């Protein structure tokens, strides 16, 4: 969506609304506003941002990264805006595909009675409390994990 | 990220005598999480002998309970392992798995590193 500057041009990555959709979702202002905002990550995970997000000019290959087991948004403090301000601001987390990895063999482990002789579950729950964030679910199934931020 | 291990501690004892392993991890990492120690005789396979989850349950083999005793510091993020009682069948390299917190963001990216191991002869 070139129209509204948001940059987002990595192959995996997605918008909710679509950057399609927020190309045609400019104000009389030059603005792209909406009102809750998710940008994913297909395979990987998707953070959602509740309430009303002024997404004009977001450059988001540069401010969000969704990986494997973990998200950085905003890499650097000294482009982080205050509290409230861009993406840096209550946010739910989904990642997908959280699981253990065997200590000698190196391997994803799966199987949820594994996880559950392990406590996976309770791992998350821990470092979910360590990081300040709040966990919400993990599903062991599909290994989606969700947890909620107040912010970045 | 990175993860070093420094192991040391291992030596010659008798039967009956005493050592002290300790496992030292360096790098660009969170925390340890889960840690334990394990040791591999020629002919055998690698076999968990203590382990302390990043939740603090402890575990140890039938054949050391009692006799080895696991410690962990994770201000310094070292591992350690008291070995009183040796006997001669405690004859191996011990190696620990510490397990490393590489999270950049938010989030649980943890993988399992091991050391070159420490050995531990015990003679008649």
């Known amino acids: 969506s070139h129209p509204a500057g948001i940059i987002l041009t990595r192959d995996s990555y997605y918008t909710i609304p679509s950057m399609e959709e927020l190309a045609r979702s400019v104000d009389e202002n030059g603005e792209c506003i909406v009102n809750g905002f998710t940008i994913g990550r297909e395979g990987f995970g998707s953070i959602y941002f509740e309430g009303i997000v002024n997404l004009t000019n977001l450059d988001l290959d540069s401010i969000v990264h969704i990986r494997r087991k973990e998200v950085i948004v905003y890499v650097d403090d000294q482009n982080k805006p205050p509290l409230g301000e861009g993406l840096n601001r209550p946010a739910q987390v989904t990642l997908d595909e959280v699981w253990p990895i065997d200590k000698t063999s190196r391997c994803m482990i799966t199987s949820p009675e594994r996880l559950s002789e392990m406590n996976y579950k309770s791992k998350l729950e821990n470092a979910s409390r360590k990081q300040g964030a709040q966990f919400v679910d993990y599903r062991p199934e599909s290994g989606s994990w969700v947890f909620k931020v107040n912010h970045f | 990220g990175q993860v070093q291990l420094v192991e040391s501690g291992g030596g010659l004892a008798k039967p009956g005598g005493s050592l002290r392993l300790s496992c030292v991890a360096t790098?660009?990492?969170?925390?340890?999480?889960?840690v334990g120690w394990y040791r591999q005789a020629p002919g055998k396979d690698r076999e968990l002998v203590a382990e302390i989850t990043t939740l603090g349950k402890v575990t140890y083999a039938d054949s050391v309970k009692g006799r080895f005793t696991i410690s962990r510091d994770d201000a310094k993020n070292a591992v350690y392992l008291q070995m009183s009682d040796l006997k001669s069948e405690d004859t191996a390299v011990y190696y620990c798995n510490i397990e490393a917190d590489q999270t950049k963001g938010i989030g649980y990216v943890v993988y399992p590193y091991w050391g070159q191991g420490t050995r531990v002869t015990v003679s008649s």
């Open positions: 790098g660009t990492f969170r925390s340890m999480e889960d």
